[PDB]
Amino acid sequence: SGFRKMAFPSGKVEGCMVQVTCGTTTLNGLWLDDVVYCPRHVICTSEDMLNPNYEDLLIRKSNHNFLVQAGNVQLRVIGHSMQNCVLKLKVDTANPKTPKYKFVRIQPGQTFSVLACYNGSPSGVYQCAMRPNFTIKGSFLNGSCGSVGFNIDYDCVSFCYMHHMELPTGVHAGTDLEGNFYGPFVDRQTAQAAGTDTTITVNVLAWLYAAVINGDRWFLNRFTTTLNDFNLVAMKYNYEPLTQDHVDILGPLSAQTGIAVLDMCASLKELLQNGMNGRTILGSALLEDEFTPFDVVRQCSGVTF
Amino acid sequence: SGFRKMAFPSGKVEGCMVQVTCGTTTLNGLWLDDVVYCPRHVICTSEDMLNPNYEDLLIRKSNHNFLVQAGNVQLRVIGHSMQNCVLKLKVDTANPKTPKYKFVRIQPGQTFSVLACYNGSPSGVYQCAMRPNFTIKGSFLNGSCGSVGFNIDYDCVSFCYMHHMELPTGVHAGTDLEGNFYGPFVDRQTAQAAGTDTTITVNVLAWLYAAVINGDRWFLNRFTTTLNDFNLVAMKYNYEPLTQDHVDILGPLSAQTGIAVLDMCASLKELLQNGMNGRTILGSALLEDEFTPFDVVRQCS
Ligand SMILES: */C(=C1/CCOC1=O)[C@H](C[C@@H]1CCCO1)NC(=O)[C@H](CC(C)C)NC(=O)[C@H](Cc1ccc(F)cc1)NC(=O)OCc1ccccc1
Ligand SMILES: CC(C)C[C@H](NC(=O)[C@H](Cc1ccc(F)cc1)NC(=O)OCc1ccccc1)C(=O)N[C@H](/C=C1\CCOC1=O)C[C@@H]1CCCO1
């Protein structure tokens, strides 16, 4: 038993991380088959980051302007192109450690593991959630751009995130591996702010089920609430509305524990109105929302990858 | 910026995990060079779990009684021995993925990463701390024995934990890689319980420094405390005593932030007295104690 914020094993991704240098800018790249992916702002100088014209900057750079280092071996770049906010560097050698992989775009509320890297070397791994405002609450220092987020399904690595920037509140913004930003952000050093962050209601409910599974049940009650009545309360506390799809997804956990979703919603509604009253749930004094229903089933059933 | 409960990348350890089967028991083993390490209770029968005589049980086994599987390949066992509560299986092949590694015994309050495994396959990685009562608050299901905890420094893996058992409160007990249990626990299914769990005070203080480094100052105050007065108060909240050694260890963070250690101790005294009053610190509504001073420096710099 027990319940922890667990990341996917990172070995398959560690074997793809490289170092990319253009001029004085050095960050991380993702080496898959014979291509290295990295943020396009690697071609910017500290002064070109204010109002960059990436079309112009890239036209002026050549293959030799890019230095790619895989460990202590330095990869010959034979071509380069741009796809949205990611730079694609062709190298003359396929990564022999390329795993089975896909590029996937995640949606808010879905979780993934972040492999934080510096100078092409992986330093740490942690589990994150894409927030409803399309930011992530990460831990990144300078030089961490190009770090990637991923999930593992069967034996396939699904890359879903590449790190690009930090917003003034200390939260982080990035793109998918096709270079499309998550959220209304741009890769420029102009004033930007994320919208109001809301709570991922379906994930909070999944975590309450995990708590029950592990024997935490002081918060349960005899009452049930309708989806419409619950949503009236949730919107007042900056909670995401719960849809019928969300209820369906919690079905498995609802059956395993014998607690109806709308009964858990009543428990959650009361927790929102009265707080937690000096009690904790699974070792937390806050309502945790970075576990999806699948995450709970996966951890409580010992799924391996 | 930001602050997260961060684990080490697990690849170097993934390449060492194998499946070990003896009789009807299947669990995880650690394959380093030409030796596979696993809990010795893999040799127990369903009736031998209360008072096993492991020396006697092992004498009765032959090399072919142990089935070791690295992926879909079977490793030939050519020898076996016991070191405390760990079984050592000699195989005819050195693991080509063996990293640089050390065996280390950690002290309470020290953190490490756990690679939870089942049937020799990794399922997840998470960061843990050795609690003052010599347990860990892990996430483990049946079949997880032999999962290991580790740190990585440079490219060297320091193995510090191997998982053996769960105690009635849902907490976990295991050994170092020399087979010596952390705490007074034994690999027998006789009644055992962990002592009262206390809070790792020095780690809470390091995390408050991390909060300041990250721009949070709302919990500070104008007071200072003596070390003795702090410990008299903290022990009333089931906090571990803070020693002068702990104060010395916080010196670097005290210098980086310009906040004296005993001044931060005064802030913690007030936080214990008032709670958080609906506020959070580094995204938590509780005082977190599973980050060491070393962890804070590494993650924040
Ligand atoms: C690892 C094993 C055992 C065989 O194959 C594996 O992979 C488990 C890990 C444990 C299960 C859940 C998470 O941690 N180890 C054991 O099952 C261990 C075997 C003993 C050391 C020979 N026994 C336990 O952990 C007991 C509790 C238990 C047993 C079975 C189970 F499925 C879950 C939990 N703990 C124990 O025996 O001592 C504590 C105790 C005993 C009696 C009264 C009060 C307390
Ligand atoms: C060209 C930009 C996109 C490079 C990028 N810029 C930013 O992240 C800045 C925030 C920042 C963070 C840490 C620093 F040390 C310096 C700057 N974002 C920003 O300016 O937002 C707009 C704004 C808002 C308010 C006032 C002014 C401007 C960048 O620095 N990426 C870093 C990585 C870099 C850039 C190139 O090589 C790297 O590794 C990752 C950072 C560090 C921590 C997490 O995000």
XYZ file of C-alpha atoms and ligand atoms in Angstrom:
696
model
C 0.000 0.000 0.000
C 0.878 3.688 0.080
C 0.484 6.419 -2.524
C 3.192 8.630 -4.009
C 3.505 11.121 -6.857
C 5.306 8.681 -9.140
C 7.109 9.444 -12.389
C 7.604 7.053 -15.279
C 10.989 5.294 -15.434
C 13.152 7.649 -17.474
C 15.807 5.357 -18.962
C 14.340 5.328 -22.465
C 14.398 9.129 -22.552
C 17.822 9.610 -20.915
C 19.372 7.918 -23.942
C 18.040 10.652 -26.247
C 19.208 13.813 -24.468
C 22.020 15.802 -26.108
C 23.570 19.259 -25.802
C 22.923 21.904 -28.474
C 24.964 25.104 -28.784
C 24.453 28.041 -31.160
C 26.755 30.989 -30.591
C 26.754 31.523 -26.830
C 23.376 29.867 -26.172
C 23.544 26.281 -24.894
C 20.523 24.119 -24.103
C 19.226 20.563 -24.442
C 18.139 18.663 -27.525
C 16.156 15.483 -28.097
C 17.961 13.075 -30.461
C 15.608 10.637 -32.202
C 16.588 8.643 -35.294
C 18.786 11.131 -37.231
C 17.188 14.381 -36.008
C 17.789 16.571 -32.962
C 14.843 18.630 -31.698
C 15.277 21.765 -29.599
C 13.610 25.148 -29.002
C 13.999 27.536 -31.922
C 15.169 30.360 -29.623
C 18.547 28.613 -29.380
C 19.501 30.839 -32.327
C 18.792 34.036 -30.362
C 21.348 36.180 -28.585
C 20.515 37.748 -25.230
C 19.504 40.830 -27.244
C 17.544 39.024 -29.970
C 15.059 37.613 -27.447
C 13.083 40.862 -27.118
C 11.466 41.035 -30.592
C 12.932 38.122 -32.552
C 12.338 37.536 -36.251
C 13.022 33.799 -36.320
C 12.679 33.652 -40.099
C 15.514 36.186 -40.406
C 17.742 34.715 -37.696
C 17.512 31.193 -39.104
C 18.194 32.296 -42.679
C 21.503 33.746 -41.455
C 22.649 30.546 -39.702
C 24.242 27.519 -41.372
C 24.690 23.879 -40.408
C 28.102 24.673 -38.946
C 26.565 27.306 -36.660
C 25.083 24.458 -34.578
C 27.201 22.337 -32.236
C 25.548 19.089 -31.117
C 27.264 16.966 -28.455
C 26.019 13.480 -27.525
C 28.022 12.781 -24.401
C 31.614 13.439 -25.463
C 30.903 12.683 -29.123
C 30.054 15.534 -31.350
C 27.357 14.960 -34.031
C 27.758 16.301 -37.548
C 24.771 18.469 -38.512
C 23.855 17.923 -42.171
C 20.667 19.994 -42.320
C 18.349 22.230 -40.361
C 14.753 23.424 -40.498
C 12.056 24.971 -38.327
C 8.627 23.625 -37.419
C 6.660 26.205 -35.413
C 8.719 26.933 -32.258
C 11.063 23.921 -32.490
C 14.278 23.696 -34.484
C 14.973 20.393 -36.251
C 18.645 19.553 -36.836
C 19.496 16.675 -39.171
C 22.607 14.733 -38.085
C 24.627 12.158 -40.014
C 24.063 9.396 -37.426
C 20.877 7.759 -36.164
C 20.600 7.522 -32.372
C 21.197 3.806 -31.640
C 19.212 4.286 -28.423
C 16.100 5.620 -30.166
C 13.128 4.019 -28.350
C 9.754 3.238 -29.816
C 8.134 6.670 -29.680
C 5.319 8.957 -30.809
C 4.789 12.718 -30.606
C 1.485 13.392 -28.786
C -0.284 16.601 -27.750
C -1.753 16.411 -24.234
C -4.808 18.250 -22.938
C -5.254 20.128 -19.658
C -5.647 17.856 -16.659
C -3.477 15.090 -18.120
C -0.264 14.168 -16.310
C 3.234 13.430 -17.564
C 6.796 12.994 -16.350
C 9.410 15.718 -16.815
C 13.078 14.816 -17.312
C 14.874 18.009 -16.261
C 18.204 18.300 -18.076
C 21.218 20.623 -18.111
C 23.992 20.641 -20.728
C 22.455 17.560 -22.315
C 22.653 15.549 -19.093
C 19.517 14.402 -17.232
C 19.490 15.705 -13.668
C 16.060 14.800 -12.262
C 12.609 13.447 -12.999
C 9.233 14.476 -11.611
C 5.549 14.049 -12.371
C 3.541 17.093 -13.481
C 0.056 17.974 -14.700
C -0.833 20.286 -17.582
C -2.822 22.960 -15.757
C -6.205 24.169 -17.055
C -4.488 27.497 -17.873
C -1.983 25.476 -19.968
C 1.010 26.101 -17.719
C 2.897 23.565 -15.639
C 4.153 24.037 -12.084
C 7.667 22.758 -12.690
C 11.162 23.108 -11.290
C 13.556 24.537 -13.873
C 16.730 26.624 -13.754
C 18.485 28.454 -16.559
C 19.851 26.053 -19.144
C 16.862 23.724 -18.777
C 15.206 24.631 -22.083
C 14.783 21.585 -24.283
C 13.971 19.367 -21.307
C 11.082 17.102 -22.280
C 7.916 15.673 -20.759
C 6.652 12.221 -21.661
C 4.372 9.303 -20.866
C 4.945 5.595 -21.485
C 2.222 3.380 -22.979
C 3.071 -0.306 -23.366
C 6.683 0.052 -24.549
C 6.131 3.302 -26.494
C 7.379 6.694 -25.312
C 4.852 9.465 -25.991
C 6.687 12.796 -25.978
C 4.286 15.574 -25.077
C 6.267 18.573 -23.793
C 9.426 20.566 -24.411
C 10.369 23.340 -22.003
C 10.749 26.900 -23.320
C 10.132 29.540 -20.656
C 9.188 30.701 -17.169
C 6.343 33.135 -16.493
C 6.566 35.847 -13.834
C 4.698 33.767 -11.224
C 7.355 31.050 -11.415
C 5.211 28.715 -13.554
C 6.419 27.258 -16.846
C 5.327 27.193 -20.478
C 6.362 25.073 -23.416
C 5.354 23.380 -26.637
C 4.525 19.931 -27.910
C 7.233 18.235 -29.965
C 5.792 19.743 -33.147
C 6.514 23.209 -31.734
C 2.954 24.288 -30.925
C 2.780 26.233 -27.659
C 0.554 25.026 -24.885
C -1.431 28.104 -23.838
C -1.527 31.699 -25.187
C 2.234 32.275 -24.877
C 4.935 33.245 -27.370
C 8.689 32.567 -27.313
C 9.610 36.231 -26.792
C 10.736 38.189 -23.722
C 7.661 40.454 -23.747
C 5.245 40.883 -20.848
C 3.159 37.713 -20.519
C 0.944 36.240 -17.814
C -1.109 33.084 -17.432
C -4.840 33.194 -16.864
C -6.482 32.221 -13.611
C -5.545 28.660 -12.700
C -8.418 26.342 -11.782
C -8.490 22.975 -10.019
C -8.795 19.751 -12.005
C -11.944 18.387 -10.361
C -11.916 14.908 -11.907
C -8.344 14.397 -10.667
C -9.236 15.505 -7.125
C -12.030 12.924 -7.143
C -9.661 10.205 -8.383
C -7.278 11.039 -5.536
C -10.101 10.843 -2.998
C -10.718 7.315 -4.300
C -7.017 6.523 -3.891
C -7.304 7.784 -0.321
C -10.280 5.505 0.344
C -8.444 2.568 -1.232
C -5.590 3.234 1.196
C -7.924 3.486 4.172
C -8.491 7.234 4.432
C -12.280 7.609 4.677
C -13.021 10.261 7.425
C -14.311 12.566 4.638
C -17.023 10.245 3.337
C -20.680 10.889 4.077
C -24.161 9.513 3.516
C -25.266 12.223 1.094
C -25.381 12.400 -2.683
C -25.396 15.441 -4.951
C -26.420 16.008 -8.544
C -23.888 16.963 -11.195
C -25.653 20.282 -11.779
C -25.737 21.199 -8.080
C -22.082 20.205 -7.661
C -20.986 22.341 -10.622
C -22.721 25.377 -9.125
C -20.450 25.018 -6.089
C -17.325 24.122 -8.053
C -17.466 27.207 -10.257
C -17.589 29.383 -7.141
C -14.296 27.891 -5.909
C -12.471 28.040 -9.266
C -12.967 24.308 -9.849
C -13.330 22.966 -13.375
C -16.859 21.760 -14.183
C -17.326 18.004 -13.952
C -18.828 16.484 -17.095
C -20.639 13.200 -17.607
C -17.461 11.976 -19.323
C -15.527 12.652 -16.122
C -18.057 10.649 -14.108
C -17.832 7.755 -16.568
C -14.027 7.681 -16.297
C -14.249 7.323 -12.514
C -16.554 4.321 -12.922
C -13.837 1.745 -12.236
C -12.837 3.432 -8.969
C -16.513 3.953 -8.092
C -17.079 0.208 -8.382
C -13.856 -0.836 -6.625
C -14.646 1.256 -3.544
C -18.433 1.090 -3.582
C -18.704 4.895 -3.484
C -20.762 6.664 -6.144
C -19.104 9.558 -7.942
C -21.889 11.953 -6.978
C -21.476 10.721 -3.398
C -17.770 11.593 -3.632
C -18.808 14.901 -5.193
C -20.875 15.520 -2.069
C -17.788 14.706 -0.023
C -15.750 17.084 -2.177
C -18.481 19.737 -2.062
C -18.384 19.608 1.743
C -14.585 19.722 1.766
C -14.799 22.875 -0.349
C -17.376 24.530 1.923
C -15.891 23.526 5.296
C -12.251 22.829 4.454
C -10.428 19.776 5.764
C -10.941 20.690 9.443
C -7.391 20.033 10.560
C -7.373 16.558 9.009
C -5.216 15.319 6.152
C -5.839 12.969 3.242
C -3.012 10.705 2.068
C -0.539 12.913 3.899
C -1.668 16.203 2.358
C -3.507 19.184 3.827
C -4.599 20.275 0.333
C -6.886 18.681 -2.247
C -4.441 17.102 -4.711
C -5.304 17.377 -8.421
C -2.233 16.027 -10.280
C -3.377 12.358 -10.295
C -5.610 11.255 -13.155
C -8.068 8.364 -12.707
C -5.757 6.218 -14.823
C -2.814 7.222 -12.626
C -4.691 5.972 -9.561
C -5.609 2.658 -11.183
C -2.056 2.287 -12.550
C -0.392 2.830 -9.173
C -2.922 0.781 -7.172
C -2.521 -2.160 -9.609
C 1.264 -2.208 -10.130
C 1.358 -1.651 -13.896
C 4.910 -1.909 -15.256
C 6.503 -0.315 -18.316
C 12.548 28.600 -10.377
C 10.027 26.286 -8.734
C 10.444 23.435 -6.270
C 9.347 19.818 -6.740
C 9.874 16.436 -5.083
C 12.385 15.301 -7.707
C 13.798 11.803 -8.145
C 17.033 10.819 -9.817
C 16.788 9.622 -13.436
C 16.323 5.876 -13.154
C 17.943 4.551 -16.334
C 21.150 3.340 -14.688
C 19.105 1.264 -12.227
C 16.558 0.039 -14.781
C 19.377 -1.777 -16.569
C 20.094 -3.774 -13.412
C 16.608 -5.062 -12.530
C 15.902 -8.770 -13.059
C 13.257 -11.257 -11.950
C 14.126 -13.945 -9.389
C 11.972 -17.022 -8.795
C 12.415 -19.716 -6.134
C 9.615 -22.243 -5.853
C 6.386 -20.246 -6.044
C 7.910 -16.922 -4.932
C 8.805 -14.384 -7.614
C 10.374 -11.016 -6.812
C 12.968 -8.524 -8.019
C 16.726 -8.827 -8.033
C 19.547 -6.364 -8.573
C 22.044 -7.582 -11.198
C 25.451 -5.943 -10.771
C 28.549 -7.439 -12.434
C 28.133 -11.244 -12.053
C 25.993 -11.139 -8.888
C 22.226 -10.813 -8.400
C 21.102 -9.433 -5.023
C 17.603 -10.081 -3.687
C 15.812 -10.525 -0.359
C 16.644 -13.842 1.240
C 12.965 -14.539 1.940
C 12.572 -15.554 -1.705
C 13.550 -19.007 -0.379
C 10.674 -19.181 2.119
C 7.710 -21.508 1.782
C 4.160 -20.484 2.678
C 4.572 -22.329 6.000
C 8.074 -21.010 6.823
C 7.156 -17.317 7.062
C 6.814 -17.018 10.874
C 10.114 -18.510 12.120
C 12.266 -19.377 9.106
C 15.760 -20.769 9.634
C 17.293 -19.164 6.568
C 20.660 -20.895 7.017
C 18.886 -24.261 7.036
C 16.598 -23.377 4.119
C 19.486 -22.169 1.942
C 21.628 -25.265 2.607
C 18.851 -27.347 1.015
C 18.792 -25.367 -2.242
C 20.800 -25.978 -5.401
C 21.829 -23.468 -8.044
C 19.179 -24.757 -10.434
C 16.461 -24.050 -7.842
C 16.859 -20.310 -8.598
C 15.389 -18.961 -11.848
C 16.811 -15.573 -12.837
C 15.383 -13.832 -15.914
C 16.940 -10.689 -17.423
C 14.233 -9.629 -19.827
C 13.506 -12.792 -21.809
C 16.943 -14.352 -21.181
C 17.618 -16.816 -18.364
C 20.834 -16.270 -16.401
C 22.695 -19.411 -15.316
C 23.161 -19.449 -11.533
C 26.547 -20.957 -10.630
C 26.652 -20.122 -6.919
C 24.702 -18.725 -4.004
C 25.466 -17.270 -0.593
C 23.741 -15.242 2.107
C 24.882 -11.945 3.631
C 22.589 -11.001 6.532
C 19.077 -10.689 5.018
C 20.211 -10.510 1.370
C 20.789 -13.447 -0.965
C 23.665 -13.249 -3.447
C 23.320 -15.315 -6.622
C 26.446 -15.746 -8.726
C 25.653 -15.871 -12.441
C 27.834 -16.881 -15.384
C 27.453 -13.456 -17.054
C 28.455 -9.981 -15.904
C 25.682 -7.450 -16.508
C 26.860 -5.363 -19.504
C 24.760 -2.451 -18.194
C 26.388 -2.377 -14.755
C 27.016 1.288 -13.851
C 29.632 2.644 -11.510
C 28.052 1.888 -8.149
C 28.553 1.951 -4.389
C 26.710 0.346 -1.470
C 25.937 2.906 1.254
C 24.020 2.821 4.529
C 22.077 6.043 5.016
C 20.988 7.787 8.187
C 17.496 8.945 9.127
C 16.572 12.138 7.345
C 18.564 11.240 4.239
C 16.656 11.138 0.948
C 16.828 8.712 -1.961
C 14.926 7.635 -5.070
C 12.943 4.400 -5.218
C 12.483 2.478 -8.472
C 9.364 0.405 -7.791
C 9.481 -2.854 -9.760
C 7.312 -5.917 -10.381
C 8.442 -9.127 -12.099
C 11.775 -7.463 -12.770
C 10.177 -4.566 -14.652
C 10.155 -0.960 -13.413
C 6.774 0.641 -12.868
C 7.627 4.037 -11.360
C 10.216 6.172 -9.613
C 9.661 8.414 -6.601
C 11.663 10.252 -3.957
C 11.659 9.046 -0.343
C 13.277 9.784 3.015
C 14.478 7.407 5.715
C 12.192 8.330 8.618
C 13.518 8.794 12.177
C 11.765 5.529 13.126
C 13.735 3.722 10.357
C 10.740 3.160 8.065
C 9.945 4.703 4.707
C 6.570 5.952 3.472
C 6.652 4.237 0.095
C 4.218 2.947 -2.507
C 4.582 -0.822 -2.746
C 2.309 -3.709 -3.702
C 2.764 -7.453 -3.531
C 5.653 -8.510 -5.730
C 7.679 -5.346 -5.088
C 10.305 -6.936 -2.829
C 13.798 -6.391 -4.171
C 12.975 -2.904 -5.444
C 15.884 -0.623 -4.554
C 16.472 2.924 -3.394
C 19.416 4.916 -4.640
C 21.185 8.212 -5.160
C 23.295 9.225 -8.152
C 26.420 11.380 -7.821
C 28.340 12.187 -11.002
C 27.724 8.853 -12.832
C 27.941 6.670 -9.716
C 24.876 4.961 -8.283
C 24.895 4.658 -4.486
C 22.458 1.891 -3.551
C 21.054 2.421 -0.073
C 17.789 0.472 0.220
C 16.218 -2.843 -0.744
C 12.534 -3.371 0.033
C 11.446 -6.333 2.163
C 8.211 -5.698 4.021
C 5.189 -3.625 5.013
C 4.229 -2.846 8.624
C 0.623 -2.521 9.798
C 0.381 1.269 9.429
C 1.167 1.002 5.715
C 4.840 1.980 6.109
C 7.790 0.056 4.754
C 10.954 -1.582 6.017
C 14.014 -2.911 4.264
C 17.765 -3.335 4.322
C 20.906 -1.815 2.939
C 22.647 -3.749 0.174
C 24.749 -5.566 2.780
C 21.499 -7.077 4.037
C 21.324 -5.210 7.353
C 17.879 -3.910 8.228
C 17.270 -0.267 8.902
C 15.679 -0.225 12.328
C 14.960 -3.178 14.606
C 12.874 -5.104 12.109
C 13.319 -8.706 11.027
C 12.293 -10.632 7.913
C 9.741 -12.756 9.774
C 5.955 -12.324 9.799
C 5.791 -12.012 13.577
C 4.161 -8.991 15.183
C 6.245 -5.871 14.602
C 5.472 -2.162 14.792
C 7.409 1.006 14.097
C 7.934 3.578 16.796
C 6.321 6.993 16.764
C 7.219 8.870 13.589
C 8.691 12.318 14.203
C 9.335 15.205 11.822
C 12.839 15.684 10.411
C 13.410 19.195 11.743
C 16.640 19.969 9.894
C 14.935 19.121 6.589
C 11.927 21.341 7.341
C 14.332 24.222 7.961
C 16.139 23.570 4.670
C 12.772 23.666 2.863
C 11.867 26.963 4.503
C 15.153 28.312 3.112
C 14.151 26.973 -0.312
C 10.900 28.924 0.027
C 12.821 32.134 0.752
C 15.188 31.432 -2.139
C 12.079 31.076 -4.318
C 10.717 34.441 -3.129
C 8.351 33.470 -0.281
C 8.893 35.377 2.967
C 5.436 35.625 4.551
C 6.300 33.232 7.414
C 9.385 35.059 8.712
C 9.310 37.134 11.892
C 11.491 39.515 13.893
C 12.321 36.964 16.601
C 15.340 34.775 17.286
C 15.617 31.779 19.614
C 18.229 29.881 21.554
C 18.848 26.344 20.313
C 17.657 24.880 23.627
C 14.421 26.899 23.707
C 13.669 25.885 20.118
C 14.129 22.193 20.907
C 11.961 22.428 24.026
C 9.136 23.800 21.873
C 9.677 21.637 18.768
C 9.642 18.375 20.727
C 6.116 19.254 21.840
C 5.062 18.863 18.180
C 6.879 15.516 17.757
C 9.755 17.218 15.931
C 13.236 15.715 16.109
C 15.776 17.688 18.167
C 18.032 20.030 16.215
C 21.715 19.542 17.060
C 24.640 21.899 16.571
C 25.691 19.625 13.702
C 22.374 20.365 11.992
C 22.946 24.092 12.537
C 26.370 23.811 10.913
C 24.876 22.021 7.901
C 22.409 24.859 7.340
C 25.255 27.403 7.297
C 25.501 27.634 3.500
C 21.751 28.271 3.077
C 21.872 30.772 5.947
C 24.622 32.644 4.092
C 22.917 32.548 0.686
C 19.709 34.041 2.118
C 21.174 36.198 4.875
C 18.853 34.623 7.457
C 20.518 33.223 10.569
C 19.683 29.613 11.363
C 18.241 30.479 14.774
C 16.152 33.218 13.145
C 14.599 30.623 10.817
C 14.071 28.390 13.863
C 12.011 31.219 15.390
C 9.869 31.315 12.238
C 9.258 27.558 12.462
C 8.240 27.891 16.119
C 5.573 30.397 15.072
C 4.407 28.249 12.141
C 3.864 25.315 14.506
C 1.895 27.586 16.841
C -0.324 29.215 14.213
C -0.534 26.852 11.270
C -0.652 28.342 7.792
C -3.951 30.248 8.026
C -5.011 29.227 4.532
C -1.610 29.940 2.962
C 0.814 27.549 1.296
C 4.598 27.262 1.192
C 6.147 26.013 -2.063
C 2.755 24.636 -3.023
C 2.165 22.727 0.210
C -0.178 23.334 3.137
C 2.047 21.216 5.409
C 5.656 21.620 6.551
C 7.606 19.261 4.277
C 10.509 17.289 5.751
C 11.744 15.075 2.880
C 14.208 17.605 1.398
C 17.722 17.707 2.875
C 19.929 20.839 2.904
C 21.937 19.187 0.119
C 18.755 18.571 -1.897
C 17.719 22.227 -1.561
C 21.079 23.554 -2.707
C 21.152 21.173 -5.673
C 17.646 21.973 -6.877
C 17.761 25.736 -6.281
C 21.246 26.255 -7.781
C 7.531 -8.366 -0.926
C 7.318 -9.811 -1.419
C 7.098 -11.021 -0.570
C 7.091 -12.200 -1.523
O 7.215 -11.681 -2.883
C 7.442 -10.264 -2.840
O 7.638 -9.557 -3.759
C 6.549 -7.960 0.176
C 6.476 -6.442 0.098
C 5.307 -5.890 0.926
C 4.000 -6.299 0.361
C 3.238 -5.058 0.200
C 4.283 -3.950 0.191
O 5.442 -4.459 0.936
N 7.071 -8.415 1.440
C 6.244 -9.280 2.261
O 5.160 -9.609 1.903
C 6.830 -9.722 3.603
C 7.399 -11.134 3.484
C 8.019 -11.508 4.854
C 9.177 -10.562 5.213
C 8.551 -12.940 4.805
N 5.764 -9.659 4.597
C 5.073 -8.370 4.916
O 5.399 -7.374 4.360
C 3.963 -8.383 5.999
C 2.703 -7.597 5.692
C 2.147 -8.089 4.314
C 2.143 -9.444 3.974
C 1.639 -9.841 2.727
C 1.128 -8.887 1.861
F 0.627 -9.265 0.644
C 1.116 -7.537 2.211
C 1.624 -7.139 3.444
N 4.589 -7.806 7.202
C 5.031 -8.643 8.352
O 5.105 -9.806 8.192
O 5.424 -8.092 9.624
C 4.620 -7.038 10.160
C 3.499 -7.581 11.119
C 3.177 -8.933 11.155
C 2.168 -9.383 12.002
C 1.474 -8.485 12.801
C 1.792 -7.138 12.764
C 2.810 -6.687 11.917
C 14.035 33.531 -25.668
C 13.414 33.195 -24.311
C 12.096 32.460 -24.620
C 14.417 32.324 -23.517
C 13.623 31.982 -22.268
N 13.128 33.165 -21.553
C 12.494 33.032 -20.189
O 12.343 31.974 -19.674
C 12.006 34.263 -19.409
C 12.056 33.965 -17.916
C 13.508 33.759 -17.343
C 13.734 32.709 -16.456
C 15.006 32.499 -15.922
C 16.056 33.336 -16.279
F 17.300 33.113 -15.749
C 15.836 34.384 -17.160
C 14.558 34.600 -17.699
N 10.614 34.475 -19.752
C 10.070 35.823 -20.011
O 10.805 36.723 -20.226
O 8.648 36.006 -19.988
C 8.197 37.266 -20.511
C 8.397 38.392 -19.433
C 7.548 38.480 -18.344
C 7.742 39.485 -17.385
C 8.781 40.391 -17.527
C 9.631 40.303 -18.618
C 9.441 39.303 -19.573
C 14.488 31.241 -21.229
O 15.218 31.850 -20.503
N 14.394 29.786 -21.104
C 15.245 29.228 -20.077
C 16.217 28.193 -20.602
C 17.236 28.742 -21.611
C 17.028 29.740 -22.707
C 17.985 29.368 -23.822
O 18.822 28.277 -23.324
C 18.236 27.774 -22.104
O 18.403 26.738 -21.563
C 14.396 28.448 -19.086
C 13.915 29.281 -17.892
C 14.777 29.104 -16.709
C 13.902 28.560 -15.674
C 12.691 27.996 -16.406
O 12.601 28.745 -17.658
